[PDB]
């Protein structure tokens, strides 16, 4: 009971989903074949949150992998922890969206979305008390940004009562591979606001910096960034799967973190992060984690919170630890940094604790921040959009597959509205 359906779209969604499933399988001690070899009994009594049982004592993930290119499916099934996915759950098309929002939302995504909805429906009625969904995709693209928006739009109609989560990798200003990210980003984030509950924005530049300074990695690649993001994914939803001194499930973070209905764009963080060379020089105690979490160099979104107060904060600790240390430290960090908090919220921090730390570590902490400083991402993206929209450049590729000029202006007005609302409380 309280099980979650997981959806993966695009290339980022598929790769990060593979990494996330590897991490969850390691947490519950599941083979790459699907069998079980966990030592403790606490790894089984909540296995049904993410996994379904099968004949022969095997566990199959409750995942749904989707794309418009069979290459991603081939890579996923070829890699490790690849054969545990149900073969039927893979859903693919003929040719990719080719970086086009209209192609993945009106022409090619629309024909294939029916099969995906059928598979989602079949997966959802195979469980009794569905907690909700969670989706992984990218905003700067056609297949992930566009079709995933349609998918959440339909799932929210067929399941109005549940909760949706989207860990969307956001375009970075500097790190940029494609040349039409602003259009797809704006068109998708028009809809992401109105059909989800918690959007955890991620940015590749921040993760690159984290691997550069905090971990000193020589040549970091997408494996490391996906590992950090998947660590955040596992950290967010531990209280549904393990016992803890003070549990906090997804709706509790939703109620604590969302003051007004439209202000649900969070950014995550994780501690402890340290280099392999400098393992021995840290004392590994709660004050270190508390200081590292609220550092400006640790958040996984390319933004410095110093230009914005925190509306609300959530901290999910993991490990056998005290409760006076946690609460007192969360008081000192809030008293001294009073300028970086909002005055009309008396208590800004929601602490939860789970009794089971990660595998390698022995105590960890996942940070979730609903700061008002995240407006700057949308600011720069809107500036780029306006610059490329003055020329009306690259626009015939969109209008030539069933899209109109007015929708661009509608999305831009919506983002001006959203940034205004976030700025309103600073």
């Amino acid at each position: 009971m309280r099980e979650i359906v997981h959806i993966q779209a695009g290339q980022c969604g598929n790769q990060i989903g593979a990494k996330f499933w590897e991490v969850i399988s390691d947490e519950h001690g599941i083979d790459p074949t699907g069998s079980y070899h966990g030592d403790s009994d606490l790894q089984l009594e909540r296995i049904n949150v993410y996994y379904n049982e099968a004949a022969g004592n095997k566990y199959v993930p409750r995942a749904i992998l989707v794309d418009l290119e069979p290459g991603t499916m081939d890579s996923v099934r070829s890699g490790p922890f690849g054969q545990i996915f149900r073969p039927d759950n893979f859903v693919f098309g003929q040719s990719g969206a080719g970086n086009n929002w209209a192609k993945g939302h009106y022409t090619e995504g629309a024909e294939l979305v029916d099969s995906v909805l059928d598979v989602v429906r079949k997966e959802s009625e195979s469980c009794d008390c569905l907690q909700g969904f969670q989706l992984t995709h990218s905003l700067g693209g056609g297949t992930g940004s566009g079709m995933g928006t349609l998918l959440i739009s339909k799932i929210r109609e067929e399941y109005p009562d549940r909760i949706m989560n989207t860990f969307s990798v956001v375009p970075s200003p500097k790190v940029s591979d494609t040349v039409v990210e602003p259009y797809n980003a704006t068109l998708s984030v028009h809809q992401l606001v109105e059909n989800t509950d918690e959007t955890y924005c991620i940015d590749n530049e921040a993760l690159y910096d984290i691997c550069f300074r905090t971990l000193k990695l020589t040549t970091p690649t997408y494996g490391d960034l996906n590992h950090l993001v998947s660590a955040t994914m596992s950290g967010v939803t531990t209280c549904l799967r393990f016992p803890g001194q003070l549990n906090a499930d997804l709706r509790k973070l939703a109620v604590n973190m969302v003051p007004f209905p439209r202000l649900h764009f969070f950014m995550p963080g994780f501690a402890p992060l340290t280099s392999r060379g400098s393992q021995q020089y840290r004392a590994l105690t709660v004050p270190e984690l508390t200081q590292q979490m609220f550092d400006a160099k640790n958040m996984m979104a390319a933004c410095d919170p110093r230009h914005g107060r925190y509306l609300t904060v959530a901290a999910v600790f993991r490990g056998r630890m005290s409760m006076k240390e946690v609460d007192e430290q969360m008081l000192n960090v809030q008293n001294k940094n009073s300028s970086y908090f909002v005055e009309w919220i008396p208590n800004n921090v929601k602490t939860a604790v789970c009794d089971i730390p990660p595998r390698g570590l022995k105590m960890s902490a996942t940070f979730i921040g609903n700061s008002t400083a995240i407006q700057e991402l949308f600011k720069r993206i809107s500036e780029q959009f306006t610059a490329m929209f003055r020329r009306k450049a690259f626009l015939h590729w969109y209008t030539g597959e069933g899209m109109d000029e007015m929708e661009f202006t509608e999305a831009e007005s919506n983002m001006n509205d959203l940034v205004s609302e976030y700025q309103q409380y600073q």
């Binding site: 309280r2 003070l246 549990n247 409760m323 609460d327 008081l331 009309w344 208590n347 921090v349 929601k350």
Partner: protein
């Protein structure tokens, strides 16, 4: 003949119930499996072949803590059906607990309360444990308390709540939940016992010298207090004080029934060697401001009525001398219209110590209950918190969307204004 049934709601209620029932099992000799290797009649029922079942009803809207009890070390003690669970918690939301998720489960628990009450020849009252901050322990306790008041109109209900602390908190919508729960705890209760986590943390930091405490220590201390209250029903002593005798001598007016507990002597196992622990010293320690289990200042308020439940090696002459010494102190300011305000009870049963706990093997103890007026300040701060958020209507869309209306917030706040006015009215 002298029986009470205890109800534990929410995570805090269930986790304190763990410590309470461990303490009672140690008190009466019952093993974790229920087999003893007639004072037990108050809390336990014999079921043939020497197996004693508790008179308990564990409730929660989430099967995560009750599952730990079910698979824990006390799996063979509680009746398997007494432990009642749901599917999805109240999610720190009052309306989810009182209206939406609570209405699908209330009948299954009222049936079992009826079944338990039928087994009692003479029922004294209830013992509800909950927390104000939560959504389960506010909405569900409100629902259950209304139903019990309608059904059992005569029995007295004693709450033991965990009031939110001034500084330390673990939730963003505690003021809303507390202000909503106050209506039920004022209308339907008989004696609400408020507790803070910061006060007990400080108590363990100063006296017990435990620098890194956790919830287990807090729950053990609260359980010790509850065992001290219901000692007169189980054991025998020179001056016995049952629940109705207890309620009289403490409640002068029908609405002024919010006392605050205390305990002494709490000390480490090593510090007891140097300390005399005579009756006068523990009596004086009970009245200091550093031993109150609510983060409040008794010096800025007057004690209306007081009750000192002793236990262990005590005789009434030392108690009388101690009370005489207390009454002549100037800092201990009593109210004029209560020329005597000391109810005394004595038992011959000294306190018990759990094997895994950090408390000394004392020889005599006292539980000090006080209906002082200082507790108004402990409420006043929380009202300030409410005033900061409700101005912006922050977090209100969850409450209104779950089913509740909006006027309930305003009327709960005005009721707290009335309660504080009443507490300020007396003692003039």
């Amino acid at each position: 003949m002298r029986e009470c049934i205890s109800i534990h709601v929410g995570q805090a209620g269930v986790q304190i119930g763990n410590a309470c029932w461990e303490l009672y099992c140690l008190e009466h000799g019952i093993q974790p499996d229920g087999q003893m290797p007639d004072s037990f009649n108050t809390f336990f029922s014999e079921t043939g072949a020497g197996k004693h079942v508790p008179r308990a009803v564990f409730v929660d809207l989430e099967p995560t803590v009750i599952d730990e009890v079910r698979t824990g070390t006390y799996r063979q003690l509680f009746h398997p059906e007494q432990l009642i669970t749901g599917k999805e918690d109240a999610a720190n939301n009052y309306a989810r607990g009182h209206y939406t998720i609570g209405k699908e489960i209330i009948d299954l628990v009222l049936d079992r309360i009826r079944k338990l009450a039928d087994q009692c020849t003479g029922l004294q009252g209830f013992l509800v444990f909950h927390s104000f901050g939560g959504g389960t322990g506010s909405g569900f306790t409100s629902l259950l308390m209304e139903r019990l008041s309608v059904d059992y109109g005569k029995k007295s209900k004693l709450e033991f709540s965990i009031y939110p602390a001034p500084q330390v908190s673990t939730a963003v919508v505690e003021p809303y939940n507390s202000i909503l729960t106050t209506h039920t705890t004022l209308e339907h209760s008989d004696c609400a016992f408020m507790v803070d986590n910061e006060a007990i943390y400080d108590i363990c930091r100063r006296n017990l010298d435990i620098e890194r405490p956790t919830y287990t220590n807090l729950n053990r201390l609260i359980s010790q207090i509850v065992s001290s209250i219901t000692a007169s029903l189980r054991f025998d002593g020179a001056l016995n004080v049952d629940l109705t005798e207890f309620q009289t001598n403490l409640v002068p007016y029908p609405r002024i029934h919010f006392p605050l507990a205390t305990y002494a002597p709490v000390i480490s196992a090593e510090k007891a060697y140097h300390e005399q622990l005579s009756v006068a010293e523990i009596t004086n320690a009970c009245f200091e401001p550093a031993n109150q289990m609510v983060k409040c200042d008794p010096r800025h308020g007057k004690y209306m009525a007081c009750c000192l439940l002793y236990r262990g090696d005590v005789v009434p002459k030392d108690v009388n001398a101690a009370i005489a010494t207390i009454k002549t102190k100037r800092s201990i300011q009593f109210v004029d219209w209560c020329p005597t305000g000391f109810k005394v009870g004595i038992n011959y049963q000294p306190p018990t110590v759990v094997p895994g706990g950090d408390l000394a093997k004392v020889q005599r103890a006292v539980c000090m209950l006080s209906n002082t007026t200082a507790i108004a300040e402990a409420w006043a701060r929380l009202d300030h918190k409410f005033d900061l958020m409700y101005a912006k209507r922050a977090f209100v869309h969850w409450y209104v969307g779950e089913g509740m209306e909006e006027g309930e917030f305003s009327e709960a706040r005005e009721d707290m204004a009335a309660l504080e006015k009443d507490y300020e009215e007396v003692g003039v």
